[PDB]
Design a protein around this motif. Structure first.
Motif, PDB file in Angstrom:
ATOM      1  N   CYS A 132       0.779  -1.222   0.000  1.00  0.00           N
ATOM      2  CA  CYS A 132       0.000   0.000   0.000  1.00  0.00           C
ATOM      3  C   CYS A 132       0.826   1.296   0.000  1.00  0.00           C
ATOM      4  CB  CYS A 132      -1.009  -0.037   1.154  1.00  0.00           C
ATOM      5  SG  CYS A 132      -0.322   0.149   2.804  1.00  0.00           S
ATOM      6  N   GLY A 133       0.141   2.423   0.074  1.00  0.00           N
ATOM      7  CA  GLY A 133       0.781   3.736   0.163  1.00  0.00           C
ATOM      8  C   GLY A 133       0.915   4.247   1.591  1.00  0.00           C
TER       9      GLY A 133
ATOM     10  N   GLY B  54      -2.237   4.095   4.149  1.00  0.00           N
ATOM     11  CA  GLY B  54      -2.427   2.784   4.704  1.00  0.00           C
ATOM     12  C   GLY B  54      -1.421   2.434   5.772  1.00  0.00           C
TER      13      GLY B  54
ATOM     14  N   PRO C  95      -6.233   2.395   1.668  1.00  0.00           N
ATOM     15  CA  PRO C  95      -6.807   3.153   0.583  1.00  0.00           C
ATOM     16  C   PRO C  95      -6.315   2.839  -0.836  1.00  0.00           C
ATOM     17  CG  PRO C  95      -6.383   4.554   2.470  1.00  0.00           C
ATOM     18  CD  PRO C  95      -5.646   3.295   2.686  1.00  0.00           C
ATOM     19  N   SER C  96      -5.021   2.562  -1.031  1.00  0.00           N
ATOM     20  CA  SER C  96      -4.419   2.527  -2.349  1.00  0.00           C
ATOM     21  C   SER C  96      -3.405   1.415  -2.439  1.00  0.00           C
ATOM     22  CB  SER C  96      -3.667   3.808  -2.641  1.00  0.00           C
ATOM     23  OG  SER C  96      -4.452   4.964  -2.390  1.00  0.00           O
TER      24      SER C  96
HETATM   25 CL   LIG Z   1      -2.622   3.611   1.059  1.00  0.00          CL
END
Ligand SMILES: [Cl-]
Ligand SMILES: [Cl-]
Lengths: 304, 304
Positions: free
Chosen positions: B242-243, B246, B272-273
């Motif tokens: 993740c990014g 997260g 999220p991503s």
């Molecule tokens: Cl993220």
């Protein structure tokens, strides 16, 4: 059969497969239906997640991999190597990837994110250099195991067990033609076998890009430039963002969909991998070059 | 009878947005609490903002505020919100114009341009404010142009109240003691909190902040170094990639998980991503710098 809507997964393993299927919409102006099996939606963004799982699951059952004893050695830096590093990490294995130094920095980095040991070999010896080095490692360490043997042993099987049956269920037992790349490592053999086990007379077409004979009714050749152009049209028309092999498959499927005997029929093909992995590669170079030279608005326009 | 994407063929990639999986944190969680990750990284364009993109087009169209093939969608975004608006706009036949500073990566320009979006660059010095100014100028000059931000305001919390939150409720078996998400904007926080309180949940609501307010029980501050470290630990422990957001959410979840009163309890947070978008950014520069200095095996060791 893990139900994602009513359960929390114990392991990211359980999120592999059961991928969506999608009708080609704007890009399909034919009288046939074209179904995209969306393998790009796997957790690590390609069909090879199914193979990585198969390797750990089936080799452990055979007693040929032993969690936290075996060192997994893989002489490949593409999606199969990514999946072995990804799933090896969460099972506790050390994973070694041997790869030529000439392979992209981005490939090195993704493997290392999962904690693999990346060992680089001379550019001048190519893929063979990496195979020699992997064999050197296994000869020196009796706990090390070459993964590629298991990739060869289980690949068609996992697709006969999972991918094929999913397609059969998603299309409600209605497949007139199945199309995928001839490369092996892919789904062609196993999906074809699954369909043939279900009774299905489906036409099986192997796609062969250009720069088991019983299972394959036709080899369809696709020029590189057409695969690349198709990948970009697909994203703009239908929002499917994939790599070179998906573009080639879609190009082929759209030609086959215009054959007279395919009118009113259902054609299935595979989208093997998500496109984002390839943004820095030749596949999307045309777009990278375009955006590299865009102008910039002057601050004097923006300070009112 | 709501569309089941594991068992039927979708008409549109829209139908694959949301209905994301949920996953237990395991190797990284050495507490007596359960930590559930809502895997928004698994959306079709690899982030939570796919839900906002869809809500914008679907709800604006239903209210006659966006007219397909007539409206020009204009957004000032260097983020996933712009990516989703460009992605879904292309499918629906809208022209999409994205403003962003020249200082954003080429990769980010390239992603937007793959969808066919017009990319307009503004001065590095003026930052996002200059991109906002330019978006407003573009809209002023074209009577068919509409500013997407107004819709994001109107529909962001609502879409999460309708979809993300009820998904979390069913996936956890009606069992949520704590819900954690980033304040940001575009976050799931408000909408999920509204859904949880509507469905009778006594979940504590925690807003994660770097170092509707009435729904929030606690603000939890996370230092950037802890967010970054946590993102890299997650890949190697649990295979979650993740990014930064997260990373921060999981750090906060793990700290809250150590509280005595959370023994046996269920903490839900959001990823999220997907991480691949960030592989060439500061978040994973530690890994990149490492693989860029690796030694190469000498040809003499491998030449045959
Ligand atoms: Cl993220
Ligand atoms: Cl692909």
């Amino acid at each position: 059969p893990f139900d994602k809507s009513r359960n929390v997964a114990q392991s990211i393993d359980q999120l592999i497969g059961q991928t969506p299927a999608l009708y080609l919409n704007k890009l399909n102006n034919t009288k046939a239906k074209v179904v995209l099996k969306m393998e790009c939606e796997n957790p690590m963004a390609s069909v090879k997640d199914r193979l990585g799982f198969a390797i750990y699951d089936k080799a452990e059952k055979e007693g040929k991999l032993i969690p936290g004893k075996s060192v997994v050695v893989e002489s490949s830096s593409g999606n199969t190597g990514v999946s072995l590093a990804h799933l090896g990490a969460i099972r506790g294995y050390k994973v070694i990837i041997t790869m030529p130094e000439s392979m992209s920095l981005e490939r090195r980095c993704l493997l290392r994110i999962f904690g693999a040991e990346v060992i680089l070999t001379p550019a001048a010896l190519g893929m063979k250099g990496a195979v020699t080095m992997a064999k050197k490692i296994v000869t020196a360490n009796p706990n090390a195991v070459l993964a590629d043997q298991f990739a060869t042993k289980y690949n068609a099987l996992i697709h006969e067990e999972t991918t094929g049956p999913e397609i059969w269920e998603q299309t409600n037992h209605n497949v007139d033609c199945f199309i995928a790349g001839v490369g092996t490592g892919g789904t062609l053999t196993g999906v074809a076998r699954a369909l043939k086990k279900m009774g299905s007379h489906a036409r099986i077409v192997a796609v062969e890009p250009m720069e088991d004979r019983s299972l394959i009714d036709e080899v369809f050749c696709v020029a590189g430039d057409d695969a690349i152009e198709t990948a970009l049209k697909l994203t703009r028309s239908d929002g499917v963002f994939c790599g070179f092999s998906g573009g080639a498959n879609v190009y082929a499927a759209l030609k086959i969909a215009e054959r007279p005997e395919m009118e009113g029929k259902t054609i299935v093909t595979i989208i093997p991998s998500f496109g984002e992995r390839y943004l820095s590669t030749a596949l999307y170079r045309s777009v990278r070059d375009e955006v590299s030279s865009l102008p910039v608005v002057d601050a004097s326009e923006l300070q009112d």
